[PDB]
Amino acid sequence: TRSSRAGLQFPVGRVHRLLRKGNYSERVGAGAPVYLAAVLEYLTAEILELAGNAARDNKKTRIIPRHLQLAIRNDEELNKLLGRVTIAQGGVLPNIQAVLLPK
Amino acid sequence: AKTRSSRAGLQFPVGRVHRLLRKGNYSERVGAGAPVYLAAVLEYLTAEILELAGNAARDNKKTRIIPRHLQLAIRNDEELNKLLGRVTIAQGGVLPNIQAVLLPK
Amino acid sequence: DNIQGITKPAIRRLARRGGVKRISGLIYEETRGVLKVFLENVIRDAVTYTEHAKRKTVTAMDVVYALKRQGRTLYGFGG
Amino acid sequence: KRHRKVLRDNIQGITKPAIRRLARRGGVKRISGLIYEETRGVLKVFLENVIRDAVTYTEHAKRKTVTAMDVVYALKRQGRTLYGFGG
Amino acid sequence: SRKESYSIYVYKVLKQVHPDTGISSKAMGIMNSFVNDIFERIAGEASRLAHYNKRSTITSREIQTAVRLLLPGELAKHAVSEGTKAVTKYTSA
Amino acid sequence: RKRSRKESYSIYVYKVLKQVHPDTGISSKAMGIMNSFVNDIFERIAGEASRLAHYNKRSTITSREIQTAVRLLLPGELAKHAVSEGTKAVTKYTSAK
Amino acid sequence: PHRYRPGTVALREIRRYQKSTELLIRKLPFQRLVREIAQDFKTDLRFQSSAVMALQEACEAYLVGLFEDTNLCAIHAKRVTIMPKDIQLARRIRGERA
Amino acid sequence: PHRYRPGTVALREIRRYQKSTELLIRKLPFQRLVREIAQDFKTDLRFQSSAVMALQEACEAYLVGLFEDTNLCAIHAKRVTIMPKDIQLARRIRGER
DNA sequence: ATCAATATCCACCTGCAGATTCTACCAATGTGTATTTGGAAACTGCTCCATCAAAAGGCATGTTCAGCTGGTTCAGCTGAACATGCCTTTTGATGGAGCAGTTTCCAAATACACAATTGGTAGAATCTGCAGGTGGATATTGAT
DNA sequence: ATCAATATCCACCTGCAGATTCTACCAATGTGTATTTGGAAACTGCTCCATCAAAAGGCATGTTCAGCTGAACCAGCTGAACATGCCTTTTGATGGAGCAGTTTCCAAATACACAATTGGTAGAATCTGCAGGTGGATATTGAT
């Protein structure tokens, strides 16, 4: 497989196919789906990392949506990227306005 | 009729729109009904805007429609305003509008 | 009048999660208005998709295509 | 192989009155003292962003010159679309 | 080097709507840009609809469900109509 | 009963998952979230690539384009590190071939 | 007996509810409301249970978010209380409202 | 001589400026501000004059708009006066910050 | 403070189902042909940058005081807290079939290509709107 | 009031060029072959919908009173208005070429097709997390 050739877990074949049948453009170079399945692998890894640490924090082995939501909204660059995105079963970052706190 | 706009009775070219739909990669195959219906919808919205801006230019006592007129025309209308919500108009100006509580008492 | 099935305590809880302390009286009704607009819009679209699809049943994917149109993108239901 | 002047804090050329006028046209009456500096802070953020993207486009294009279309693709990217320069 | 625009057809439609009125170059730029933004919007939506329904082809039917999605209210109505009308006159002849 | 083939990323995401946290797992819901994530991101990057193609009047999507797309789409450090993983995987596939 | 001051059970409620992710609105009234709102667009329709759930997630998202932004608007007025003019301000800026 | 009360020349100004479409920020200091912001991004650039104008339009638009939403925020505070905590609420709700 | 009472926190365990490991099926996804997109080099010319002096118009800067900000108080009341009382949401259940989804046939609809021809372009010519100006009527603001 | 005075509003005019019209050159844009998409009909089955019956849990309704809101008032002061003095922007002018965009050639790179084989799917099985809960650890909240 081409992922083995490029050292990825992510299929470069499947992404070659998707770039062809989405009509993004006529000709998809051979380097494109590689670079790309790589970039997705990286960001998948990134999210899984931060979410995993968050998952060990609440003392669970299984990552549940709440963990992911936390990881994303907590990280800054990821949070920017996922701004318009609503994560199912997410919850919010527990945060209270200071001036409603009992004085 | 020879040309296709003539055949469907339009001022907007149904041919050029066929060309654009094809060499834009929207999809493999572009039906014969699509650029027709489309050059129709473009023609229609072009017409609605031009009407509203033209009346607005008559209101300011002028022969030529200038961007300020179009800006007006779009923003006074409720639906054109929603569609062009995120769009900024070159040389537009704003809707003359002042807040009440800033007005003299 | 199913619009009242959105109970006062549900909206109270929703505001709780939103980080709010004290809720006015009118608010509930006002909420109920907003909520409707939202749903009206989204579903309007979702349903359109279902109609293009010549299907009689609205599927989660229609919902998602609509939400993506609204700029409200949703993850986790089959996007 | 021929010099430039250096360019430094041209951000103060956005004069207090330009910011006052821009504020009038916004339907504003009384402007605090602080606002000017803060305006600029915001304006800068804006430009940085837009121009970043516009230049990225000029860079993809192997051109040394930024064109209106590049600007426009950028603004359209940010969700800020502009009409009248060639979209 | 030849460039392509809608300025001639927007002259047409202007004269249809207001015979005695004219239009400046900047303004024409606004229009041409406008038509184009719209084009990309609808055609895009049509396209997305294709791949959503696993169809390799863009029929007038798709443009239509696009125009229903993209256009708000009364505008959507008068437009879907002006179209159906244009396609139907096109079909017979 | 009968089968209907569906397609997803949950397997490659298990792999990458096991790479990062060997001792941790992932629920169904969360996996749906990742599947969606990859898909949205994908569509985003490829969309922008496409626009770059048409902007520059080109019939082909080169990795070069994927790249300028990622610089545009991704914020800051994320951008720098993705451009790395990509250029990297492509040079490795290049010499391998 | 025992009575907590006004506002305390609020704060404990806030911590408690912000910390979970579960669906706050009763699902059936919501489902009825969705089927109704859909009736008027097209009659005799069916709903995948997953699609209803999907909408519920979308709407509770919408509202909690709008509330964050509301609370911030009333806090802008030196007030701890959210009101209809606050919500109309939020929507008015977001672009949602005219 | 003659002196107008505080606020009269304010309203005469709002009317005057809302009524026109010409560029409020002088073009040269804006052009230096754009060549500077690009200098330090990629060095040695050239700018089509139209690109300068396009930027000017985009930015004055952004800002006039932001000022409106600011005003609506300060008026919500029962104030005739705008302040950075206002502008920052505007941007905070729009999502920018 | 120092002091009680609900409410919450965490500890331990156990079982339930949903995560995870294994099985066999199967349909997507290396070499060879033919074509063409665009990278490269060679040239043309547009327009972008630099600079300058003069014109002037707007910026800056300081004084002065008006009305706007927020600090303070203070009454009413509008929401919160808490109990009791009522109802419909939840869940599990089975049954019924609406209909979504999968397959096979196959023809109506478009891709593909060559040769024709005309609408759409640019360039040039020209002319009518109106930008710029000035005076002069009128309308508004603030002073008495 | 009544009154000047600053500013805006409104009309003609006058000259300039930008809209707009004439013109000729030219490149996108009627008919026949070839391929396959989806419409159409035929069957299978997934899960969606109905009404239903218990189990509580949540909503509702009310009483009682706390503190939040806003009306109202007052002192300080911060931002408006105005002139005058100065600076830097605008204009257009020219000159110079960086370099954008247009052209022509040559190949490295990808699409197309046939043919083969295994990663990736669903379905089945099994098993390890953690939800659910109960009971004291331990943290606040309100009253002393």
Numbering used by the authors:
A (entry chain G): 16 to 118
B (entry chain C): 14 to 118
C (entry chain B): 24 to 102
D (entry chain F): 16 to 102
E (entry chain D): 32 to 124
F (entry chain H): 29 to 125
G (entry chain A): 38 to 135
H (entry chain E): 38 to 134
From the paper:
sequences identical to those used in the nucleosome binding assays. exposed to the solvent without a crystal packing contact. are not flipped out of the DNA double helix.
by the nucleotide excision repair (NER) pathway. octamer, including two copies each of H2A, H2B, H3, and H413. thus operate in the context of chromatin. recognizes 6–4PP lesions in the context of chromatin.
